């Protein structure tokens, strides 16, 4: 609402915030950071109208109208942001087996994804709209199903030896345990 | 004039007009003769309720004599060209040009009242000038005679035979007879 | 002018006009000759206030010389489709398919005031152009003629030859005759 | 164009045309030529007042020269069926059914301006056609004839006879001359 | 178009159109042919300021060039009614029913600027028909005709045989010669 | 259509038509054929301009072809009466009656642009009918013409005599001819 | 009568017209004749959608039978000096001006609707009185007919000699021969 | 019916027409035949953005066919007394009048599409009556026409004698013809 923004400028300004309590409380070493999720909302609002217009909005636009420029005026910086790359998103799935694998070490297991598997993986939970908030699950769902079945009795107790690898007519991962 | 009606929206109470109620439950009204600015009207309600909720379907009444078919066609392509099914129950009164876009409702969704009424006529125009000025114009009106007819019997499901021998002169269709020929697949009775 | 009357709820109060207050009471006003875009506020209404409360019964003054036949099936087709029962009352005059709208109300909620009058003949309508096309027009006439009879033989209850030979010529019937005929069941003395 | 005015209330000021302002004080003006359209918002605005105070006085402001004697007659229908007394007041002058509506009003409540001046005469209507056509609407207006001595005779308490033979022709009352004849109680001018 | 005005009153800021800001200070505006609908209008204005402070005198400016006799009555009928004293105000011209209206005014508070008109001419009518309606319609002109000049010689306090005699073809009156005669009090040019 | 505009308050912004916006800056605009109507309003909004300041001047905008006499009276004899000096500019073109209402201003206020038209002509009118009737028309037609020459003459500062010559037919003047004949002060290029 | 419609913007429900929603979206509806009046009011909205953001390309909607060439002309002219790419629909009918409009949007922006029939012929005009004048008037008329042949070439991209021949008379262009005859490609319904 | 715009502002959104929403802009439009009434409402704005800001242009469109003469001095004094220079934009059908106010347009800043129509034309009126009184308004016009063109010659710079020449009778002139005629400085880049 306006009002919780006119408490941001005190705190800009005067360095100093009061309450219904009466505690001063001291912002000279505070930081502050902000997130704008405007942007993504309109990438994927459709357009009345008989033919999808194409809306490739830039960061800057959005603030000038929503935001007030006195808000701008204190600003110190602001950063902008489009997509990390096509291979840092085939990178996010190594980072996730890397803790992924931290955890097979504590049981004791060894598990291997082929190269080309781990690529359309990463495609798959990534998304433009979405970015990466769905990586995240689509990562445990693809092996924590499985192996959660063998775990409890099986080769995993044991070393694991797991091996794992798509199916080009399938497209579905395929688990083979060797203990 | 336009009787004004309340919403109970959670936010608040909020006063419509008693066309822009309905429309807000995806219905749009067909009244009167056909014409470009209310066609296009008609028009410009179906891309609003496009973008609202493309899966649900719009439902639409016909009430009306006929009119122009230039401003007609354009809703029977917006009606093809939407994804969302385009429901036409007809109320009261059709003509050649209102039975042709009741006909261009999606298959299972047109209906017809009981008492309803139904017409279809061959197009009527005509033209003044030079003898060859008379021939071009002609061809345009026997074009979309034939044009109208096919894309009658697409949607009808009949011969385009006995489609050109029916329409060659007026001919009125009950809702029960309609039902028959294939005009409308059903009388609106039950949901 | 149509003027503004204060309704006063818990909410706080909202201004509305005086026909809009007495729709949210479900009180449609038939007024003027009949056509397609008075029958479809017509028709609009009753969709609303059956929405709002199915179960209550729905109110429909009738004052009107008389209009276009389709147009009344409109609003004639949409009381019997409704659940809520559409009583009717006749205020000042009733005519063709104005009439035939006021024994369409359910039974044992139709009524007339105590100087009210009815009158009631069959369609008026021509055409012109080759004996062909007047066959069938006239033809259509004798249908809807036909159709309409058997219609106010089902609500007021009487042979359908009775009514036949009585529509032919123009009959103006009072208040209290119209008792005995079967168009409404009583006179509106009082709840 | 119609002024508006400022309503002091405690939770605020209210905007009101001047004629609403009047409504909300029980004053509802009865202007112009009798047509079934005005009637209802004069009917619409006598119902609203008997549920904002069924049991408080109604004033009706006439300063009509006639109209329409069927549309009247739903007004005075209204009249009566309601318990509020609806008190009635001659403003210029009265005609056909603006008259018989200024004698309906409650007794003691009817008055009339020192200068207003009443009007009164038979129903003059026209029918052409059909011999039988002729007889049929002209028993009509016969008929409505006899209604109208009756109704005026009940309220002015005067014979059939001294209406009908006063009625034939058009009879001028000044305030004080339609005192006698007992279209009104008393005059205004000191109450 | 309407000129809309802000008042900035010590509740908040208000906006209203020029007539209506008018009104609240109990100016009223005739101007036109009069008519049953301004008149009304006119009549109502009277109504609402008298409750708003009886006390306090309204002023009325008269710039039309004559119209309905009957209307005029209503308004010549509600100033002598209310308690308020009805200053009258004659900008531009004054005819028969203006002037009536002007003279019609408290005595001490009728005014005329010193480049204003006034003129004064007997009613005139027609009709048409049988001998025997001409008859009853003719006193009715005479008997009006009388009480107009009835009533001039009261305000303007004149002989009956003066007002009739002058009134008995139009007659203009500058703003000073108007003095004299009656209708007026003093011109407005200072105080 | 009439453009909206914006403008800044310390409480919120404030919109007003483009005409009700120049309104607050004393700017009235006199467009079109002179008419009661039209007049009303033109001494609405003086007489409200004179409460808000009586000391600052108004300014009275002047691009009527001409119109009735009666109405341009209300106007002058409103400029007149009230304190404030009215300030008259001519643009595009004013006649009889716009050049009286353009002298009419106070002295050092009258205003015409270099491309300005100034007419003036005796004024116009007929009467048809009865000798005896045309005889008084006649008589106040001239009656006016002299009380139009005598007012010229004030403003303009010529002598009767001269005034008569120049209004016995019409005459158009230049806008460095008024400066001139002495109806306005002087061009308006600076301030 | 024209339906509101609600729109859920951030800081709350807006309630206006179903043309101005469809305008926000860079939406304009041309139907009716063409004259002086509704082309100030095209012209105005394209003016406003181009300050406020230039980059994005406008959609036009033609169901025009006709109207009058200086009135269609001033909508021609506003087109092409401005960076948004106004894109063409043919709803139901095109006409002389009406086709013109329609060709004068960007290449392969423009589109047609199939069951649109479109037509075009030379402008018909004529002036009476003293022959000097008719002379002056017809001679004018002959050479901004000249005007729409050269600007109709352009963009269709077809020789001069085929459009001035084809415009003598009425020439009736379904959507499938408009496609051949190069003025406009086919809608996209996928 | 003329569609709303919604406006961006910090303390809330507010909604406008198009036509006012482009006066915000200093944007002016004139169409249809010259009138009383018309040419007042265009003098509202010039004074209005006058004094929102005396410095920045103002710009104004012109589609109308000419109407009557005195109406239009009131909006060519006005354009002349205000500060803001106006920038005429001739965007169709420019007449006798309709021309007259993009000549006094300030130099450097008149501008014409490159498919607009300007025609001059001398002023056309009549009277009838008495011989005594058509001598006064057949001298009246007369002099009205030199008026006119002597302020033609004035902002396009052409002598009387040309100016006269060329509006004896009824002139069409193409926009860019215009150039070289002085009427306007030069047609719109993009």
């Known amino acids: 609402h306006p009002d919780v923004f006119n408490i941001l400028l005190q705190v800009m300004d005067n360095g100093t915030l009061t309450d219904n309590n009466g505690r001063k409380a001291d912002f000279r070493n505070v930081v502050l950071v902000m997130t704008t999720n405007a942007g993504v909302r309109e990438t994927e609002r459709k357009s009345i109208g008989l033919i999808h217009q194409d809306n490739s909005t830039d960061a800057m636009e959005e603030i000038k109208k929503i935001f007030t420029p006195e808000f701008r ?35 004791g297991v060894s598990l291997e994804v082929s190269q080309e598997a781990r690529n359309w993986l990463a495609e798959k939970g990534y998304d433009r709209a979405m970015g990466a908030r769905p990586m995240a699950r689509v990562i445990q769902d693809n092996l924590k199903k499985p192996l959660a079945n063998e775990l409890l009795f099986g080769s995993l107790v044991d070393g694991g030896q797991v091996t794992v690898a798509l199916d080009k007519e399938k497209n579905e991962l395929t688990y083979g345990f060797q203990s | 004039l336009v009787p004004m009606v309340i919403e109970q929206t959670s936010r608040g109470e909020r006063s419509f007009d008693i066309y822009s109620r309905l429309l807000k439950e995806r219905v749009i009204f067909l009244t009167g003769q056909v014409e470009d600015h209310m066609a296009n009207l008609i028009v410009a309600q179906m891309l609003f309720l496009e973008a609202e909720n493309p899966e649900k379907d719009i439902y639409l009444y016909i009430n009306s004599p006929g009119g122009v078919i230039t401003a007609g066609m354009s809703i029977y392509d917006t009606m093809q060209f939407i994804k969302p099914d385009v429901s036409t129950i007809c109320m009261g009164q059709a003509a050649s040009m209102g039975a042709f876009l009741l006909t261009a409702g999606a298959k299972g969704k047109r209906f017809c009242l009981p008492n309803s009424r139904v017409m279809i006529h061959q197009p009527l125009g005509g033209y003044q000038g030079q003898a060859t000025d008379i021939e071009i114009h002609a061809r345009e009106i026997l ?8 894309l009658m019997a697409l949607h009808t499901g009949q011969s385009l035979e006995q489609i050109e021998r029916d329409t060659e002169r007026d001919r009125f269709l009950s809702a029960p007879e309609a039902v028959e020929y294939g005009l409308v697949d059903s009388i609106l009775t039950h949901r």
Do not use: A, C, P, Y
């Open chain 1, 73 to 107: 005026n204190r600003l110190d910086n602001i950063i902008w942001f489009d997509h990390l790359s096509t291979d840092v998103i085939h990178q996010v799935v190594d980072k996730f087996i890397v803790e992924l694998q931290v955890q097979l070490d504590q049981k």
């Open chain 2, 143 to 150: 074009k979309v005679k034939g044009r109208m007819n096919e």
